[PDB]
Amino acid sequence: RPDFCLEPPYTGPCRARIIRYFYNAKAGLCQTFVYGGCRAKRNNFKSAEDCMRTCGGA
């Protein structure tokens, strides 16, 4: 539902390569993206099920 849920996926500065989830509102579903390890924003979920539950339908 929310408004962080519309914000684009933030990799940030750290050089990890960690696959996370974000709410893609242009697709209408939760997608994967490369999270660099630090300073995550809120549209950053550790599973699709969480993502769908917080953001799903935004």
Binding site: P13, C14, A16, R17, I18, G36, G37, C38, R39
Partner: protein, 223 residues
């Protein structure tokens, strides 16, 4: 002239892959049961992979050993990225040979100008995406603190160093974190962070390993 090059198989024998289903970071073997990596690489459910080249095929030189413990530095700061260091204990000791070897801890810090080797299976495009199969290397000089702190004003601590080329084009990137910066045989840095990758005026930022040598030696000794 492209920054990284294909190191060669098992030519960087102390490189590890940290895996949790896929390769998420690097790390350095500092003795047969310990790995040093980046605190921001801390996950549950790591398997460390040793003796890799191609992380996607089983070339025969591998030892895949799960970790029993992961110790993040007591003062790691998630925001400021300060003290971005973690130690990882293997379930069981690695069998150490020619393709699988450890890297000595510094006995002093490297000066600006010192040329180092940065290895890792991170993204090989500055802008773009391409994750290699085999290990890539990069030789990149240590940067002066003064220049480092001009590149990232108000953000560099005593525990950090910049390395690379103000020109950009040659850097380390996403996938690279935790992996070594070896200088003159000794382990000096840990791949940590940056603004993008391989940008002009934005060198990579590394954990200054020679700051922690005491902490590591001891922490190893009593765990």
């Amino acid at each position: 002239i492209v920054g990284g090059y294909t190191c060669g198989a098992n030519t960087v024998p102390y490189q590890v892959s940290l895996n949790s289903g896929y390769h998420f970071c690097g790390g350095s073997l500092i003795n047969s049961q310990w790995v040093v990596s980046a605190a921001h690489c801390y996950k549950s459910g790591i398997q460390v992979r040793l003796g890799e080249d191609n992380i996607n095929v089983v070339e025969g030189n591998e030892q895949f050993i799960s970790a029993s413990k992961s110790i993040v530095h007591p003062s790691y700061n998630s925001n400021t990225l300060n003290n971005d260091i973690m130690l990882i204990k293997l379930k069981s000791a690695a069998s150490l040979n020619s393709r699988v070897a450890s890297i000595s801890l510094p006995t002093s810090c490297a000066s600006a100008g010192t040329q180092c080797l940065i290895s890792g299976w991170g993204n090989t495009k500055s802008s773009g995406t391409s994750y290699p199969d085999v290990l890539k290397c990069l030789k990149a000089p240590i940067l002066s603190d003064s220049s480092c702190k001009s590149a990232y004003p108000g953000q560099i601590t005593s525990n950090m160093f910049c390395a690379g080329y103000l020109e950009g084009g040659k850097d380390s990137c996403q996938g690279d974190s935790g992996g070594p910066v070896v200088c003159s045989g000794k382990l000096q840095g840990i791949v940590s962070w940056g603004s993008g990758c391989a940008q002009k005026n934005k060198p990579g930022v590394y954990t200054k390993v020679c700051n922690y040598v005491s902490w590591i030696k001891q922490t190893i000794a009593s765990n």
